[PDB]
Design a protein around this ligand. Structure first.
Ligand code: CDL
Ligand code: 3PE
Lengths: 70, 171
């Protein structure tokens, strides 16, 4: 009956679920377990490049806190 | 023209605030509260001199007062601050609004152990006044002497001497 349309809808739903979950896991993987930094504005880009400099390992996502200062 | 004068590399050595942008953003309100005076002396010197070479030492005072700002966090409230800037650091836009309970723990421990009150909505954007001893720059643009203006019109307006003087027209 009407539940015969649900396997195709479920397959199409998995195909629509793959890009979002994929880009979420890839952005968590490539950014040190966290969200990708959003730099729409030049202040955000300046802070992100300053993070890349102060990390010392050429990665913006490697965070340095109070342990880095004496 | 001339040689542009630059300070030496020893004149630029200061101990850097080597912390991340989420670390700076986490403590930024208490930083603007407690490190007001050297930061504003520096930014006054920076908008008035219009020259960063004349703004090194005040800048060093900024980098002197920021580090003492973080040491005073590290001696007292290292763990709630760390729990707070980690939560700031997770967000891609670095939302303050996702991190209110860690903010509350950090603000509680800072008000208890250091007595610092966090600035309210509208305080760190105030135009404040700065009492320095350095003199006012009399020519910050290094402008030379302006050309003298043309002489203005004076004297009462007389009629035209014998009119237009155009070939034979007597008026
Ligand atoms: C107390 C308060 C009250 C007091 C009241 C006192 C007055 C009471 C009376 C009231 C009426 C006053 C009339 C005006 C003042 C006198 C004007 C005068 O005689 O000027 C002499 C003027 C120069 O003589 P002046 O000895 O040096 O001056 C004596 C005065 O002191 C003249 O004064 P100025 O020395 O200061 O002159 C200034 C200067 C003197 O001029 C100059 O310095 C040289 C430059 C002049 C222009 C040259 C242009 C040339 C190329 C174009 C030619 C066009 C074609 C010719 C005309 C074809 C037909 C239109 O004028 C100009 O440059 C302006 C241009 C000329 C205008 C003249 C007046 C025209 C009014 C009537 C128009 C009708 C047609 C007239 C002829 C048009 C052609 C001019 O003569 C000419 O230039 C030759 C033209 C003839 C003069 C016009 C006479 C006006 C009356 C005409 C009646 C008949 C009409 C017939 C039907 C229409 C024609 C088909
Ligand atoms: C994001 C999600 C995307 C999902 C996409 C896919 C959705 C559909 C998934 C498959 C659904 C079941 C398909 C079954 C097909 C029929 C199988 C079968 O029994 O075929 C029989 C045929 C002949 O058999 P025979 O041995 O000759 O029989 C004589 C018996 N005495 O034997 C044959 O024809 C040979 C065997 C053919 C098997 C084909 C199976 C389907 C292949 C589809 C390609 C995509 C598969 C999934 C990819 C993603 C996952 C890895």
């Amino acid at each position: 009956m009407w539940f015969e349309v649900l396997p195709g809808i479920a397959v199409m739903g998995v195909c629509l679920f793959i890009p979002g979950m994929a880009t979420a896991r890839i952005h968590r993987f490539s950014n040190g377990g966290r969200e990708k930094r959003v730099a729409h504005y030049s202040y955000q880009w300046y802070l992100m490049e300053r993070d890349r400099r102060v990390s010392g390992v050429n990665r913006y996502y490697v965070s340095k806190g109070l342990e880095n200062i004496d | 023209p001339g040689i542009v004068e630059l300070p030496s590399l020893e004149d630029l050595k200061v101990q850097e605030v080597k912390v991340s942008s989420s670390v700076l953003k986490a403590a930024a309100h208490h930083y603007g509260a407690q490190c007001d005076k050297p930061n504003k002396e520096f930014m006054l010197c920076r908008w008035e001199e219009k020259d960063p070479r004349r703004c090194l030492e005040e800048g060093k005072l900024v980098n002197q007062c920021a580090l003492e700002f973080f040491r005073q966090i590290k001696r007292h409230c290292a763990e709630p601050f760390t729990e707070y800037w980690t939560c700031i650091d997770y967000s891609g836009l670095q939302l303050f609004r996702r991190c209110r309970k860690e903010q509350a723990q950090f603000d509680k421990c800072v008000l208890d152990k250091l007595g610092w009150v966090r600035p309210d909505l509208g305080e760190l954007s105030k135009v404040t006044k700065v009492k320095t001893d350095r003199p006012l720059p009399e020519n910050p643009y290094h402008s030379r002497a302006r050309p003298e203006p043309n002489p203005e019109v004076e004297g009462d307006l007389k009629p035209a001497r014998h009119g237009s003087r155009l070939f034979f027209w007597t008026m």
